């Protein structure tokens, strides 16, 4: 048969210069899922038996040195850091070898066949360092790749016949111009590294399908019906309420669904706040649901403390207050003890003049509930945050590449990724301490993008801060779960 | 190999006492999709050849009478009602037989092997009546079942190996476009941007062009599949009266002036396709598209801060004289005019418009209203193909819950009422149709059918080649809920003249 | 040995006209307690291995119609309503058959032998409706009986002798 | 014959450090135009059948690292950016290999022979980046050239003869 006479690609792993001798680089249990074709045949069979052959190909060069060791471990032996692989019957893999080196994994079992449901006890293959990699020329190259291919052995067979992963979340449409961020609902057109770090809870799901925010994966109008509205022909109507009182929201009670999580910016008199979340709406009467036809205006929202007399920006939801104020004079003011609020969920940015500013929100402006994990740089990897263009009140005509500058809005995750995360559970597809890596194919280069357990995305930009343009993207290919301590490739 | 020695279940068909001699009951084309195991092996190969055996099992009794005929038809012969099956080499199946009857279908082909994507010319198996079934004892039993089992022949083989994830030529099919999350509460319609909560059949028929793509990668509208700002710079804005205080701003411009819109010049991107509802004075318009916004200066981009109000948008004609609703894009005027008093009026010959795309419906009071828009309110460009009922199948619109101005707190189930919107397609389906091309997936006159499984019962949903969705509701016009939906299973192409299944 | 050359009665079940296609009528796991004679000898042995042959007799008549399907399920597969018995290698039993239809149940096992106390993983035999029973004449009859018989295979044997009064 | 026992130059393509893994660097359809001598004899014949052998020479050096993968695609399968070349039966070409690497492309066809006018369905050969190229020394050198040579297989032959002045 043709499907058992040639080798086929199975997996690829990275060998670094910083790996001390005795470290394990690659491990795999005996199973039919290690071959593209037997993994397809396993649907129509209930058991299997026999060995498998592996072949390693080193994509090194003629100037490197160092060796690996590969051995097969019988069942019933614990695998851990203190494993003397150099004592088991093994083979030596050189860093600068040309011809591929093969090891054969016999099927050591106590039973007669392995059912596809519960395999039982099976051997294991381990690749560990024999002598660490060296590079006499120094430089910026410090890692090489190794590829693994498999082929069923002569005695492999299937016995009884029966009736017949987070890789799909990120696809080319998500980043080519169709997907949108989760904070401003705009086309994603860039990636913005954040060396300092940040944190986010609103509309940000992890891989356990649980979020610490107060919003749902959609953009819908904000509705709150118990608040204080007062004003001091043209006046600035002001609305505020106590945080942690929105009982009508089933997901969480800190704030109404869709409330922006930016710190409120104080402003009074003839002035325009800078870097503020602006939405269109007004006040309505809670008695009968009728809207007050004079307070339709461009209101600005946020989080603040000491609202009635001494407003002050804040970054914690514990004992805070929510503020909604109009940026321009309203037609007629209203003083009601109990009132409702209604504003569109897709915001814009406020700016006193027509010149653009830096991207928003800056890392210090995010308001998060207590108990949220933080995204901090690890190794050479840097967290990034997706940037999109957003209209500004200073100039509405400027949309992209205008001579007056460009305003970029930023979000933690693309919307489809968040929707997928909140729809299902991926806790079993990744263990802590490692990333899930995608590869991006540019017009004249490439780079890798990695997702952690908490839901943040990481890139190997290091101590840089320049925005990365996405107008040259072609397609995205999944790579697989890789350790979080390895530098991601950045070739641009 | 064990998988090629035993028979396995393929299909079942019914034989009725009302079938006249010469009728055809069951036809299948030679293909590896006729066996449970070759249908799986074909995923990892590129060609096949050889014959296949068929075994027929009759679930009858010893009291009935009658016979069938089975024959294999060579390639190149037209199949139809007037086919002399009994003159081809054939076998006879008895209605009261015990042992299964087996017929072998050899591989008659002009080539050497069949590529899996495109089989080419292949033979066909036809079942017909030889003598009509009879029931001497009478009674309520007037039909019997027949089951078909298949087994590969001794010469069957696959020839060429390929990657399991590879795709053959013309292998595209929109099976994955519609999926359970889309109609469970994640997807939204392409008119009101609210989650889908109902289906509203339209016996009258309708047409839609804005934000609506067919299965050929083209649309006749002016909006891209996305909600964003509605932007336009060249337009006239003026208000009546002398003292500008709590006055109504009105903005109008000639259609076909959206030069900066690349997809089309008919209207600014994202403009609704709703006919204008003229009104003046204190009167509040009924069933209109209302979006927040204002007016911005065309000289520097700064906005006139005093013009911010809840505006209403629509198509009309004769704007200066008197608004007149129209449903024709050619020779019309795009006009937006505020419904509430603005802080201070503005009089410019040239002025801009900036309105959000997430709109609401204006009502005079807290009373609810029928689903909007009505089929006579859609503004559509010339040349837009229409949707009309075919047989018992009727087009549908997707129903979502949408905010209304009269009561902006009534969401669902409220005693005040419940307002419903209507959309031609779910948004994910629109995006999927926009990205790719599905022209080589259906012949003109076929419906790709999805089967929806509710909590108690199931129905089927069909999709035409123009993007319209059809269902066989007959003459009913009631909304149907989806809070009971569980899963959706694809079915495949079907003739458009077959009535859809509505098992409720 | 005469005790392994003839079929003997095991159990009987009812097939009714109200059973739709796909419902399961009779299931049994591989065990020595499916034969009246093997159950006695199981007292003096500690393990067993081998197959068993099943024979089905239908107490029908010439006026009924309908068919059942019988198949053997390999170990490790869940048994329940969502099982396609019709896609496993099977045989067909007709409602008016005269000569009994026999299916052989091989011993699919991962171990050498099954201990008498805890057998471990064993195959299962399943009957299901393949076409629902019908009665053209109607009347007062709505169901028929089906009788099951077993016989040890040629390879069935007991492995190790143990004290008759011992406890597992 | 001398024209079917030696390799002759056909084409050349460039492999650079900016090529991501999975990128396709060279595609060619099976035709007699891929060899200098089958092209000239193609005038006086009407149809052909048989395979063709390809040989790749890498003009690299012992300092570079990286590998290419070549495979033959059956007819009727779409070629595009999302093609898993590494799952087809393939050969690997090294960036610092010295001896040339040869892969034989068989004539996979559904018909008897390929007419010279309309060849119909034919196989395709694809080179893809299997591990990206790396230069430890750095500097300006960022690409190497690969030369491709062809030779008719043993079963290559022309079937029907026609006047050289005819048009298809």
CSV table of C-alpha atoms in Angstrom, one decimal, chain C:
chain,number,residue,atom,x,y,z
C,1,UNK,CA,-18.4,-34.4,24.8
C,2,UNK,CA,-22.1,-34.3,24.1
C,3,UNK,CA,-22.7,-31.1,26.2
C,4,UNK,CA,-21.0,-29.0,23.5
C,5,UNK,CA,-22.5,-30.6,20.4
C,6,UNK,CA,-26.2,-29.4,20.7
C,7,UNK,CA,-28.0,-26.2,21.1
C,8,UNK,CA,-30.0,-25.5,24.3
C,9,UNK,CA,-32.5,-22.8,25.3
C,10,UNK,CA,-31.2,-19.6,26.8
C,11,UNK,CA,-33.8,-16.9,26.8
C,12,UNK,CA,-36.9,-15.6,25.0
C,13,UNK,CA,-38.0,-12.0,24.1
C,14,UNK,CA,-41.0,-10.3,22.4
C,15,UNK,CA,-41.0,-8.5,19.1
C,16,UNK,CA,-44.0,-6.1,18.8
C,17,UNK,CA,-45.5,-4.1,16.0
C,18,UNK,CA,-45.1,-0.9,18.0
C,19,UNK,CA,-41.3,-1.1,17.8
C,20,UNK,CA,-40.0,1.5,15.3
C,21,UNK,CA,-36.9,0.8,13.1
C,22,UNK,CA,-33.8,1.3,15.1
C,23,UNK,CA,-34.9,0.3,18.6
C,24,UNK,CA,-33.0,-2.4,20.5
C,25,UNK,CA,-34.8,-5.6,21.5
C,26,UNK,CA,-32.2,-7.8,23.1
C,27,UNK,CA,-28.6,-7.4,24.3
C,28,UNK,CA,-26.3,-9.9,25.9
C,29,UNK,CA,-22.6,-9.8,27.0
C,30,UNK,CA,-20.2,-12.6,26.4
C,31,UNK,CA,-20.2,-14.9,29.4
C,32,UNK,CA,-20.3,-18.6,30.3
C,33,UNK,CA,-23.7,-18.0,32.0
C,34,UNK,CA,-25.4,-18.0,28.6
C,35,UNK,CA,-25.5,-21.8,28.5
C,36,UNK,CA,-27.1,-24.0,31.1
C,37,UNK,CA,-24.2,-26.4,31.1
C,38,UNK,CA,-21.3,-24.0,31.1
C,39,UNK,CA,-22.7,-22.3,34.2
C,40,UNK,CA,-22.4,-25.5,36.1
C,41,UNK,CA,-18.8,-26.1,35.1
C,42,UNK,CA,-17.9,-22.5,35.8
C,43,UNK,CA,-17.9,-23.5,39.5
C,44,UNK,CA,-14.8,-25.6,39.2
C,45,UNK,CA,-12.6,-23.3,37.0
C,46,UNK,CA,-10.9,-20.0,37.4
C,47,UNK,CA,-11.0,-18.6,33.9
C,48,UNK,CA,-12.3,-19.1,30.4
C,49,UNK,CA,-11.7,-18.1,26.8
C,50,UNK,CA,-13.3,-18.7,23.4
C,51,UNK,CA,-16.4,-17.9,21.4
C,52,UNK,CA,-20.1,-18.9,21.5
C,53,UNK,CA,-22.6,-19.6,18.8
C,54,UNK,CA,-26.1,-18.1,19.0
C,55,UNK,CA,-29.2,-19.5,17.2
C,56,UNK,CA,-32.5,-17.6,16.7
C,57,UNK,CA,-35.9,-19.2,16.3
C,58,UNK,CA,-38.9,-17.0,15.4
C,59,UNK,CA,-42.4,-18.2,16.2
C,60,UNK,CA,-43.9,-16.3,13.3
C,61,UNK,CA,-46.2,-17.2,10.5
C,62,UNK,CA,-46.5,-16.8,6.7
C,63,UNK,CA,-48.6,-13.6,6.9
C,64,UNK,CA,-46.1,-11.4,8.8
C,65,UNK,CA,-43.4,-9.2,7.4
C,66,UNK,CA,-40.4,-7.5,8.8
C,67,UNK,CA,-36.7,-8.0,9.6
C,68,UNK,CA,-34.2,-7.8,12.5
C,69,UNK,CA,-30.5,-7.2,12.4
C,70,UNK,CA,-28.0,-8.8,14.7
C,71,UNK,CA,-24.4,-7.8,15.1
C,72,UNK,CA,-21.4,-8.2,17.5
C,73,UNK,CA,-19.9,-5.1,19.0
C,74,UNK,CA,-16.2,-5.0,19.7
C,75,UNK,CA,-15.1,-4.1,23.3
C,76,UNK,CA,-14.8,-0.5,24.4
C,77,UNK,CA,-17.8,0.8,22.4
C,78,UNK,CA,-20.7,2.4,24.3
C,79,UNK,CA,-24.1,0.7,23.8
C,80,UNK,CA,-27.1,3.0,23.6
C,81,UNK,CA,-29.9,4.4,21.4
C,82,UNK,CA,-27.4,6.3,19.2
C,83,UNK,CA,-25.8,3.1,17.9
C,84,UNK,CA,-25.9,2.2,14.2
C,85,UNK,CA,-26.1,-1.5,14.4
C,86,UNK,CA,-26.9,-1.5,10.6
C,87,UNK,CA,-23.3,-0.4,9.8
C,88,UNK,CA,-21.5,-3.2,11.7
C,89,UNK,CA,-20.9,-6.6,10.0
C,90,UNK,CA,-24.3,-8.2,10.6
C,91,UNK,CA,-26.9,-10.8,9.6
C,92,UNK,CA,-30.6,-10.4,8.8
C,93,UNK,CA,-33.4,-12.3,10.5
C,94,UNK,CA,-36.7,-12.4,8.7
C,95,UNK,CA,-40.0,-12.6,10.5
C,96,UNK,CA,-41.3,-15.7,8.6
C,97,UNK,CA,-38.0,-17.7,8.3
C,98,UNK,CA,-38.3,-21.5,8.9
C,99,UNK,CA,-34.7,-22.6,9.3
C,100,UNK,CA,-33.0,-21.0,12.3
C,101,UNK,CA,-30.4,-18.3,11.6
C,102,UNK,CA,-27.1,-18.7,13.5
C,103,UNK,CA,-24.5,-16.0,14.2
C,104,UNK,CA,-21.1,-16.8,15.7
C,105,UNK,CA,-19.8,-14.6,18.5
C,106,UNK,CA,-15.9,-14.6,18.5
C,107,UNK,CA,-14.0,-13.8,21.6
C,108,UNK,CA,-12.4,-10.3,21.0
C,109,UNK,CA,-10.2,-9.8,24.0
C,110,UNK,CA,-7.0,-7.9,24.9
C,111,UNK,CA,-5.8,-10.4,27.5
C,112,UNK,CA,-5.1,-14.2,27.4
C,113,UNK,CA,-8.2,-15.3,29.3
C,114,UNK,CA,-11.2,-13.9,31.2
C,115,UNK,CA,-11.1,-14.5,35.0
C,116,UNK,CA,-14.4,-16.0,36.3
C,117,UNK,CA,-14.9,-13.2,38.9
C,118,UNK,CA,-14.1,-10.1,36.8
C,119,UNK,CA,-14.3,-10.8,33.1
C,120,UNK,CA,-13.0,-7.4,32.0
C,121,UNK,CA,-13.7,-6.2,28.5
C,122,UNK,CA,-16.0,-8.5,26.5
C,123,UNK,CA,-18.0,-8.2,23.3
C,124,UNK,CA,-21.8,-7.6,23.2
C,125,UNK,CA,-24.5,-9.0,20.9
C,126,UNK,CA,-27.3,-6.6,19.8
C,127,UNK,CA,-30.7,-7.1,18.1
C,128,UNK,CA,-32.5,-4.2,16.5
C,129,UNK,CA,-35.5,-3.6,14.2
C,130,UNK,CA,-34.4,-3.3,10.6
C,131,UNK,CA,-37.9,-2.9,9.2
C,132,UNK,CA,-40.9,-2.7,11.5
C,133,UNK,CA,-43.2,-5.7,11.7
C,134,UNK,CA,-46.5,-5.4,9.8
C,135,UNK,CA,-49.7,-7.4,9.7
C,136,UNK,CA,-51.9,-7.1,6.6
C,137,UNK,CA,-54.9,-8.9,8.1
C,138,UNK,CA,-54.9,-6.8,11.3
C,139,UNK,CA,-57.0,-8.2,14.2
C,140,UNK,CA,-56.1,-9.2,17.7
C,141,UNK,CA,-52.4,-10.2,17.1
C,142,UNK,CA,-49.8,-7.5,17.7
C,143,UNK,CA,-46.6,-9.3,18.5
C,144,UNK,CA,-44.6,-12.5,18.1
C,145,UNK,CA,-42.1,-14.3,20.3
C,146,UNK,CA,-38.4,-15.0,19.4
C,147,UNK,CA,-36.4,-17.8,21.0
C,148,UNK,CA,-32.7,-17.8,21.6
C,149,UNK,CA,-30.3,-20.8,21.8
C,150,UNK,CA,-26.6,-21.1,22.4
C,151,UNK,CA,-23.8,-23.6,21.9
C,152,UNK,CA,-20.1,-23.3,22.7
C,153,UNK,CA,-17.7,-22.8,19.8
C,154,UNK,CA,-15.0,-25.3,18.8
C,155,UNK,CA,-12.3,-23.2,20.6
C,156,UNK,CA,-14.1,-22.7,23.9
C,157,UNK,CA,-12.2,-24.1,26.8
C,158,UNK,CA,-11.6,-23.6,30.5
C,159,UNK,CA,-8.1,-22.9,31.6
C,160,UNK,CA,-7.4,-23.6,35.3
C,161,UNK,CA,-9.0,-25.9,37.9
C,162,UNK,CA,-9.9,-24.6,41.3
C,163,UNK,CA,-11.6,-25.8,44.5
C,164,UNK,CA,-15.3,-26.1,44.1
C,165,UNK,CA,-16.2,-24.3,47.4
C,166,UNK,CA,-13.7,-21.4,47.0
C,167,UNK,CA,-14.8,-17.8,46.7
C,168,UNK,CA,-13.6,-15.1,44.3
